[PDB]
C-alpha cells in the first residue's frame, strides 16, 4: 500500500535527478549517477523514510490524508534516506569497512575507489535538488532547508566527536564515560533517526518547529535509548574489536572492581577472539543484561510520562507509536 | 591591505561564533579540534574569490556609500565562498592522495588526522548554513542565498564527478579527451564557484533577482572557462617560482586544454607519440610531450585563443544594459587577462 508507493516515488525522484537542468549530463555521467543511486540509496530497510508518512497520518487526527500529501511525505522520507546513504558511504570509507547489507562497500568496488568520496557529496547535494523540485512553491520551504541543514550539521558533529574520542583517545579508556557516550549518540544518531522524520511531518502540517521543543527533547531521549538498544544487541558485531565507546563497556567500567577494570583496559578492542572473549565474560559477570533491562524499562517509564505530559493528542499518538516500534526489540 | 585585514578580522569573528554554536554541545576537545582544522584549512590561501565579493558589491553600489554593516555582510559571504572551497580542497586532496598544499602537509596527511579529514570536510560544508543563518536569516533574500550556494555546490561536485570518471575509470585511451568534454568539466568544476558565485552574492546583496541576470551568469561561466584554460597553459609553461608549485598535468594524465589541442593539431606519428608518453611519471616522456607542445606552437595557439576570448567577452559585456554590471564584469576580466600567476 504505502511502502509500494514509497518505492515508486524513489523511481520518480531518480528520473527527475537524472534529468536535472542544472547539470549537463552525458551517457557516462548519467549511468554513473544511476548505478551509484541504485547501489547506495534504496537498498536499506527504509524505516526512517516511511516514518515520515506514518507520523503525518497520525497528526492528521483520525482522518484521510490526500494524494498530494502522501507524495510529498514520501519525498521527504526519501530525502532522509538520501541523507543517511550519504553519511554511510563516507563512514564506510573512514572505517575501512568491507561489507554492507551483504555486498561490498561502495568504495570497495574496483572501478570506484576514492571516487566514492565525491559520490558522497553528490548524494548530499541531491537533497536540495529534490526539495527545490517539490517544495519550492510551499510556504514552509525554507523551514525544510533549515531543518535538514541543522540536522546534517549535528550528525557530522556527532561523528566528529565519535572519531576523536575513539581514534584520538584510545590511550586511556578512562576517557569513555556515560555523558560522553550520551553526547556522541545524541548528536550522531538521535536527531536524524527520530527527530527529523516527525519534524518533517510537523512542518508539512503547518507547524512552527520552535513551538515543539518538547517533542524534540522527547525524541532525542528516545533515540538515545534506541542506540543503547543497538549497543546491547551488538554483543548479545564488532564494537569491542573496534574500540568503540559502547554503552556496555562504559557501564562495565563503572560497575567493575580494580581487577576487572584492569581486565577491560588490557583486553578492549585489540584484535583476536581471545581478547573479545574476556570482555564478553566480564559483561556476564557484572550481570549487564539485568542492568540493561533496568535501564530499558526505566527509560520507558520516563518516556511515557513525558509523552503523556504533552497537550496535543496527535503528538502523543506519534510519540507513543515511535516508542512501541522499538520497545523490547531484538532487531 | 586595508580590506584584506578587515576580511581576516571577520574570519576571526565568524570562527568565534562557530565555536560557540548553540546547535552543538562543544567540549574542550571538539572545540580545539574544530579550531585547529579551521585555522589550518580556511584562512591560509589568497582569498581572491572571497575579496571579490566586497569588490563587486562596492562596484554595484553606484553612487551610494556602503555602510560598515554592508561591508561586514559582504565579507561574510566571501568567507562562505572560502569555506566552500576549503571543504572541496580537503576532500580533493584525500581523493588525489596528495601530499602538500601551500607548502605544508595536507590536512589528512598529518598523523593525528588521517581519514578523520573526510568528516572534517563535512564539518566545513555545514559551517556555511550556520554562518548564513546567523547573519542573513532575517533578510528577504535569505532563501536566494541558500538556493545559490546549494546549486553552485551541486554543480561543483558534479564537475568533480565527471573529471574523476573521465580521468580514472575506463581504460586510459587518450582519444576520449576532447574540447567539449574539457569545456564541460571546467565549466562545472571551477567556473560557477570561482566566477559566478562571488558576483552573484554581491548581486543578491544588492537586492537583485538572479533569474533576471542569466546573461551575467553566461558571461562569468565563459570567463571562468577561459581562466581555467590559462591555468592549464601555465601548469606547463608557467614559472614554478611565481606560481608556487611545479605542474604535473602531463604525469597525472589530466584532460588539459594543451593535450586536447595537441591531439587535434598533431599528425598520426605525433598522436602515437602522445599516446605512448602522456600520463607516465618519468621526465623523459614528460620532456617528449612538452617538446611536442613546442613544435606544435601551442603557445601561439593559446595566445590567439586568449585574444579571441578577450574580444568575445568584451563584446558580450558591452551588450549589457547596466553600467555597474559592465564595470563588475570588465574588472573581473582585466584582473586575469594575460596574467602570469
Numbering used by the authors:
A (entry chain B): 3 to 238, 248 to 342
B (entry chain A): 2 to 342
Original authors' sentences:
Prenyltransferases, also known as isoprenyl diphosphate synthases, catalyze the sequential condensation of a basic five-carbon building block (C5), the isopentenyl diphosphate (IPP), to synthesize prenyl precursors of isoprenoid metabolites and isoprene polymers, collectively called polyisoprene. These prenyltransferases are divided into two major groups, the cis-1,4-prenyltransferases (CPTs) and trans-1,4-prenyltransferases (TPTs), based on the stereochemistry of the double bond formed during IPP condensation. To investigate the molecular properties of the EuTPT proteins, we determined the three-dimensional structures of EuTPT3 and EuFPS1 using X-ray crystallography. Similar to EuFPS1 and other prenyltransferases, the EuTPT3 subunits were composed of 10 core helices (α1-α10) with a deep pocket that included two DDxxD motifs responsible for substrates binding.
It should be noted that we previously characterized EuTPT2 and EuTPT4 as E. ulmoides FPS proteins, referred to as EuFPS1 and EuFPS2, respectively. In the tetrad analysis, ScFPS, EuTPT2, and EuTPT4 rescued Δfps lethality. The superimposition parameters suggested that the dimeric architecture of EuTPS3 was highly conserved and unlikely to be caused by crystal packing. Interestingly, the dimeric architecture of EuTPT3 substantially differed from that of EuFPS1, which formed a conventional TPT dimer. In EuTPT3, α6 of one subunit interacted with α5 and α6 of the neighboring subunit to form a four-helix bundle, whereas, in EuFPS1, α4 of one subunit was inserted between α5 and α6 of the neighboring subunit to form a six-helix bundle of α4–α6 at the dimer interface. As a result, the neighboring subunit of EuFPS1 was tilted at an angle of ~45° compared with that of EuTPT3. The structural difference is related to the chain length determination residues, which are conserved as bulky amino acids among FPSs, including EuFPS1 and 2. Specifically, the equivalent positions of residues Cys94 and Ala95 on α4 in EuTPT3 are occupied by Tyr88 and Phe89 in EuFPS1. The side chains of those residues protrude between α5 and α6, resulting in a marked bending of α5. The residues equivalent to Tyr88 and Phe89 in EuFPS1 are highly conserved among all FPSs. The TPT-type dimer formed a larger hollow at the dimer interface and supported a hydrophobic tunnel reaching through the bottom region, whereas the bulky side chains of Tyr88 and Phe89 appeared to prevent the formation of a tunnel in EuFPS1.
